[PDB]
Amino acid sequence: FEKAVVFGLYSITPVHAGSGAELSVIALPIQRERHTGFPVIWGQSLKGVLRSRFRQLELDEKIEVESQKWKWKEKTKEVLKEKADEFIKKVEERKRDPLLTEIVFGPATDGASEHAGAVSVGDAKILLFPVRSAKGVFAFVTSPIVIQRLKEDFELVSEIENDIELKQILSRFKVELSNNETIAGNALILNGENKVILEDIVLKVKSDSNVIENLVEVLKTLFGDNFFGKPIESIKERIAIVSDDVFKSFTRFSTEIVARVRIDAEKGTVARGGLWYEEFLPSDTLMYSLIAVGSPKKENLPKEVDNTQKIVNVLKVTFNNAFLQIGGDETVGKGFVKVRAGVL
Amino acid sequence: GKPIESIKERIAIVSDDVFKSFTRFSTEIVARVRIDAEKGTVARGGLWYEEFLPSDTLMYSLIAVGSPKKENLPKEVDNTQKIVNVLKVTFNNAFLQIGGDETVGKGFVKVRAGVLT
Amino acid sequence: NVVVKYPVNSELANYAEKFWKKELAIYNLSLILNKMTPFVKRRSESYKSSLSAVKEIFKNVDDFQNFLNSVLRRSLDEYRVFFENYERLFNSFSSKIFSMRTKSRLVVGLGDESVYETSIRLHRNYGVPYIPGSALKGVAKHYAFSILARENGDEILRIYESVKEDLKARIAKRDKIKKNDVPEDYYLTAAVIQELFEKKFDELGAIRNTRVEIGDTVISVGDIVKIFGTQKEEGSVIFFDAFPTPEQLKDKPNLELDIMNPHYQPYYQHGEPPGDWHSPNPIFFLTVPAGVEFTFAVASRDLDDLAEKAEKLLKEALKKFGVGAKTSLGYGRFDA
Amino acid sequence: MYSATFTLEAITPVFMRGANQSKAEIRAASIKGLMRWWFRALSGSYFGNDVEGLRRVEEYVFGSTKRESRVVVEVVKEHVEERFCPLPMVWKKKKGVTTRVSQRAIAPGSKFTLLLTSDDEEVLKLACYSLIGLVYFGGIGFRCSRGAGSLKISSLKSDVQLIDLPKNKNQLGQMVNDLTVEIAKILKKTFLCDHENKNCTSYSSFWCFYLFLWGEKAELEEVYYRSNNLENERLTLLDLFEKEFKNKNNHLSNYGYRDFVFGLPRGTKKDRRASPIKVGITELSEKYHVRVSVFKTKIFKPGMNVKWDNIFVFLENIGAERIYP
Amino acid sequence: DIREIEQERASFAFKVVSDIKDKYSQNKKVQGKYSSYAEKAPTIILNNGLGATLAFFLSKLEKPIDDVDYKSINPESFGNAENIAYAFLYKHLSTWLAEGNGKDSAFSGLTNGEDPLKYIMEKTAIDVAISTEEALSILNWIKKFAKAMLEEE
């Protein structure tokens, strides 16, 4: 664990991070932490799409390493000329992953015990939850628990990177809000009243400028000056911080519930029990996950990926300002996010 | 990383049997899967589920340290008290990876040592 | 006069009352429609929470439409940046983008269980009407089924007599007795085609050589089954949702009202004889007016030719079949 | 998937309103419900009191809550022109003047098509016959029972053969028995339901249906209500018919036109009964005549009954000519 | 000894579904309408909130609001089958949210002092969210038992 990269996920379309291990009132729930209920994307699911997307870029020769094209066929041939054609046949028959993917994410399931992957994809936690509001149509909602968990994440990368200067960016945040109170920008507070309406509740506004500004600066440092398509200052006034249980209620209720049916052409109506409900993460939600990078454990590594730093820049240059598919319902335009590769 | 008084309000003491039920069943169960790249769906027989200890779980160990058996040692590690300060300094407020699911970001745990009164 | 009561908790009750009287501006249409439902009470001693009932609390229907559009028009900037981001998402994949205007009225999501006894597909964030990509994929698949049935009805029945007999038996078991009624018509042809495409996808290899004419180009059955995917293979074409272009969202209204006036409802439900009684009870449902422009996008994953074929077939489906509710009454039709 | 195109054209203003009362436009749902009613009435003679069989065949043709309708109807082109025209038998409450009330309506003419499609030839023929019977024997929209919303076909393009267009009064009258025989034969061949059970229809149907003709005109401008005064000498065909209706001498009744021999909203009893007489206007060989369609039923409405002879004596009084039967 | 709340949920759902099945065994329409309403109720609660759903149940019952005491509702006193099903559903939901499976049971009820409609009327949003979770859970149990043992349509 030498260097850690933070990946920011912003849902353009609703994301159904499938769970498939439980049954609820609204069927097909999403994967959430059991003790909290906050919607999360487990690392295994998030890693799979990243690995799958990486394979296509390499197999189509689209990965730019050190601003140079990666010809994996020759790169594997130069590195592993002893079995260059033998290994190529394994990946030609899809029995093995290509050279670069096995170095970064890890060897294919066929070669499980050869070595370990160089990437530790952390779980994607909820950062900003879009919640409907009277004025300021939807407000990015955060909780003291989320930022507290974000603070520990910054402690982890600081320990990994040995950079204390990054361990005090958000250390000045300590807020104790009641259920009826909130910290929100002016765009959400109703005119002439110190109250806000977040889709089911009237919350009195607590005034403290630095809390939102501190959080706003953190995202600006994390993901640059472009908040996935809009300036951060344009959204700094729409951020609201609510109590712990208020945020929990929002994530357990404000998630999209979509009704889907199957129409049989024999009759022209919904088939017998051909209707089911699917729960989706709302559009315009922000989720972050650190991508820890260790020492690549493969033998005879190329000089372009020998160290962790050379791995980190390749990961950033290939998974920044890109669009991925998370969860199911890929063919019906669901689960699409815009990813941002940020370094503290 | 957080004030202890902020979490005192959320500490519950339950009976032994009730706590046992929480330990047995409230642990996380995740249905992992693998998908065939060519077909785009779940590969045949590629489905297995795991059990995880929930996050924000507080566990305490107890390290007992004696005098270093190996001789020919520097003065800074002379006695156990010298050895103790090495462990305390290098492990207080440090993050480890216990158990192995590292590649999928599981197992990280904050570690805070410290001697008693 | 009338009395309006709100089933929401305190404080928010007064705030929603102020919101509905246009005292305070509202920016999110979905929120005001769903979580701030007004229970308008007529001369009857009851609080009817129906769209027809809530229409009364306004001056007239035109005031209702203007208020709804004004609430929608406030979120124009945020919806515009969201649409820009969505269009940027289209350009990433090698997708085909085409735009069609609502030739007739369109209403999607009329059947979702709401307090109003009717609903409409409104975006959770900006409260704008949109067509989910699942609906587009379904209507494209069903139009392909209909074209296949019309073009090669009896042929596939000869090829697949076993499954058609199984389907006839299944219909016979469900529908009273009807032991050998089984009218071998376009309905049964479409049913057996769907059964082939849903549970017997492997048998489609024999008919993969067949081609059906859509628009100007021809499309193979194997091409169709690759486009829509099966229970064992994922589809090769991504069906994105359809959104209205925000440029016209300020000039012409994007939402409007429609009327359902079911005379002879007891005749249809309780079996009473028809005639000049059973005073009709009308209720209203929201729908996007005709002429509203929409943007559609389909992206492939293996071959771009598959994407263009799916685009042509979907264009034909929206031109003829139509999407949304009341597709049998000319609703939800588009044109170039 | 057979198709059938009908190019309609309204000879009289049409009052068809959507959700917005002020705005009037052609509605596919309203005309589809009207076709459902006209199919129920026209095929009612073949069914009589067989309510269950008629409901079954109606659910077959026009769908139900358990099966999609196999007939799809959509209006394609609408060359409409919104204008203001007065209500037939409604006058304003102005002090002294008490003139007519003119709401927005579709102008006369306004040739708009109407497209029919079905997967079965028999069901398409049945739908076409019901729609043509509705067009010929009545109007569509508000106040249709008092000479409003009637149209005629300007062009026809269909695959399944239909009845020929009548050229005069005799052909129009024979078309009633024609359409009845064709629908009876089609239903007996396809559905094979009950074969004309002997019982008077409990609802408005063709079991007891009579067609009447009254007056004639050559210029459409002098047909619909134009003069706002009874004493005016420029009374049109509709205006003259309304004046004759107002005269209590023609119809023999205790309350005259104000009795319950017509639509229910007249007097203390509000109810929802419509006028059995369906006043319409038909053009025959470029000559326009008032169509008086009367539907006789066993029971007027559950709770009370009325004497039907008042309508017939009224028709005989002002010289209405019965073309059918 | 302790009893899990899920056991009380299952017992209450089975009791109410068996009661409606036994009382209206002949009434196929009542059972079908009740099953449809039970399967459609959770979606309405999610879309419009628990209070809106509770009031909408009373809207079809033709009873006015602000006089809503569930103990003072005779669900069998409604002629229409739809009214019967709506009254049964509202009574079951309100009884669960006000008294649970009884005082002696593990779940004594959330509101415990008045009708849940009034609870939503004059109480904070955290309590109404807890009530919404409880209502969704009991509705899931009732929907399962109705889809299992009650005749559909």
From Swiss-Prot, chain E:
Lineage: Archaea, Methanobacteriati, Methanobacteriota, Archaeoglobi, Archaeoglobales
InterPro entries documented for this protein: AF1862-like_dom_sf, CRISPR-assoc_prot_Cmr5
Entry's family note: Belongs to the CRISPR system Cmr5 family.
Gene3D superfamilies in the cross-refs: AF1862-like domain
Main location: cytoplasm
Xref: CDD domains: Cmr5_III-B
Signal peptide bounds: none
Entry protein name: CRISPR system Cmr subunit Cmr5
GO cellular component terms given for this protein: cytoplasm
The organism of origin for this protein: Archaeoglobus fulgidus (strain ATCC 49558 / DSM 4304 / JCM 9628 / NBRC 100126 / VC-16)
